[PDB]
């Protein structure tokens, strides 16, 4: 999958509410905070005696992740997220396909 | 050891005909759900105007 | 190695031919279907005698091979190869299957029984109706009894019941003897090797008239 670095789409920002130019990047999840309630609850449950107090997932089955596109409007800087289908190889702004060329291995 | 019957429709129509098979009931005015929104929007205003015109005509 | 033929006698299954869906199918034991003087002219062998099935069953290719050899050998031995034309009129297109259960002691330990019991190709058989022709032999009228005896011997090679019928028709043609003679005297038949061609009053007039110069338009 090859996706261009720019994409003209609808912007929900109240200044636009129309198709504007967006700059496309790949979404990457932020780091897990040590002070989120769920993590503060987990640490308290794990302290003391009793061993592992929650389930740890083991039976991995998927080999891909859905790629999320981060679309930032070039006007108002509003962000939009867009998920794609599962793919093993993803790149942004790769060289476009050209057919009718003698392949030159 | 636990092999048993997989599937059958035996006796199923007999059960269905004890209290069925009932036709659905019809009404003079159908629900306008699923009807085109633009038509439904204007049909509201047409019925409203008819009521006013008939009320006025009944008044005089 | 062959099960007795009673295990595959009757047409219990839908036809199962060699195709894209069962490739590894062994060949039939019968290869030759036309025996004797197959290059003979239609006029040479007027008498036609049929061995007709009286059963709705499956005839193995081994049975067809045995019957062919028996009838051919007897008629050739008594009246020579040139006295007849014998044709097998059924082809074994049905594939038989076998489950291959081990026949030793202790087999219950190894084999799986009726689990996954779909069989492997086992042999070939022809499916025949009641009243279907199994073998046809055209010959001269003077060789009638020898051909009947040849077909009588070949009958014992088949399961079930079969009849030997003398046909009213001329050789392998679809015309009675009198109809074939009437067509012949009007110049509406020509030899096409072992068979003939008939006049059609439809189509290109000039081509038809060239094809049958002896035709007597009436």
């Amino acid at each position: 999958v090859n996706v261009p670095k720019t994409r003209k789409t609808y912007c929900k920002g109240k200044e636009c509410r129309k198709h504007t130019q967006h700059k496309v990047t790949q979404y990457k999840a932020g780091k897990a905070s040590l002070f989120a309630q769920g993590k503060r609850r987990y640490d308290r449950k794990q302290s003391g005696y009793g061993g592992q107090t929650k389930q740890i997932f083991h039976k991995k089955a998927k080999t891909t992740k859905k790629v999320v596109l981060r679309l930032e409007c070039v006007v108002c800087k509003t962000k939009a997220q867009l998920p794609l289908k599962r793919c093993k190889h993803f790149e942004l702004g790769g060289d476009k396909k050209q057919k009718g060329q003698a392949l030159q291995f | 050891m636990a092999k048993s019957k997989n599937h059958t429709a035996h006796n199923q129509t007999r059960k269905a005909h004890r209290n069925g098979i009932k036709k659905p009931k019809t009404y003079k005015y159908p629900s306008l759900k699923g009807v085109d929104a633009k038509f439904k929007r204007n049909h509201r205003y047409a019925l409203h105007g008819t009521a006013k015109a008939l009320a006025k005509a009944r008044a005089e | 190695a062959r099960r007795p033929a009673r295990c595959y006698r009757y047409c219990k299954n839908k036809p199962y031919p060699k195709s894209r869906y069962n490739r590894a199918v062994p060949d039939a034991k019968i290869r030759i279907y036309d025996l004797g003087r197959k290059k003979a002219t239609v006029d040479e062998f007027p008498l036609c005698i049929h061995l007709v099935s009286n059963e709705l069953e499956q005839l193995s290719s081994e049975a067809l091979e045995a019957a062919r050899i028996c009838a051919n050998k007897y008629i050739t031995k008594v009246s020579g190869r040139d006295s007849f034309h014998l044709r097998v009129r059924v082809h074994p297109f049905h594939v038989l299957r076998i489950n291959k259960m081990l026949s030793c002691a202790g087999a219950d330990r190894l084999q799986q029984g009726m689990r996954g019991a779909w069989g492997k190709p086992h042999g070939l058989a022809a499916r025949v109706s009641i009243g279907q022709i199994i073998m046809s032999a055209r010959t001269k009228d003077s060789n009638k009894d020898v051909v009947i005896e040849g077909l009588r011997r070949a009958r014992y090679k088949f399961p079930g019941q079969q009849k030997i019928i003398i046909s009213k028709k001329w050789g392998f043609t679809p015309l009675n003897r009198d109809e074939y003679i009437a067509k012949k005297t009007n110049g509406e038949v020509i030899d096409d090797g072992a068979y003939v061609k008939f006049l059609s009053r439809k189509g290109n007039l000039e081509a038809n008239l060239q094809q049958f110069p002896n035709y007597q338009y009436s």
Partner: protein, 159 residues
């Protein structure tokens, strides 16, 4: 394993008729559908958009909604011990007017005409349809038609 996809078992039902492939004749797109019309559903395999499910192939229903390129048809489907009202959106390539309805409207018109005729003429006309009655009596002449005797024929073989 088993396969129960959306168009499973439609190998022949959705094929086009023999030597009837290709473009849709424009009379299909010129018919006019109104709410309350009775239409027959027939999937056209060349139009993949707005298709019926295989269940509704060959069923007949009432039009309840009219959109740009399609109609909504009401079908009654048996589910267990009762019918369920089903609502299907069908592009007009998969729909056709039902002929029995036009015949019934013909009968309504004719019946009103006859009743008006009888009214203005001073008599009464019976307007219910009737099933075929037993025939009445009749006398058959033998002029040129002397009864001819037939007998069962003997068995013969034509082999």
């Amino acid at each position: 394993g088993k396969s129960r996809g959306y168009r499973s078992g439609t190998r022949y039902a959705f094929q086009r008729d023999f030597k009837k492939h290709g473009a849709i004749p424009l009379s299909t797109y010129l018919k006019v559908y109104k709410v309350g019309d009775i239409v027959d559903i027939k999937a056209n395999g060349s139009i993949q958009k707005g298709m019926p499910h295989k269940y509704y192939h060959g069923k007949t229903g009432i039009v309840y909604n009219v959109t740009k390129s399609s109609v909504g048809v009401i079908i009654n489907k048996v589910v267990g011990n009762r019918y369920i009202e089903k609502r299907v959106n069908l592009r007009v390539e998969h729909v056709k007017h039902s002929a029995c309805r036009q015949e019934f409207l013909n009968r309504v018109k004719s019946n009103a005409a006859k009743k008006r005729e009888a009214k203005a003429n001073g008599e009464t006309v019976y307007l219910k349809r009737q099933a075929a009655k037993p025939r009445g009596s009749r006398i058959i002449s033998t002029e040129g038609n002397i009864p001819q005797t037939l007998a069962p024929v003997a068995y013969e073989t034509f082999i």
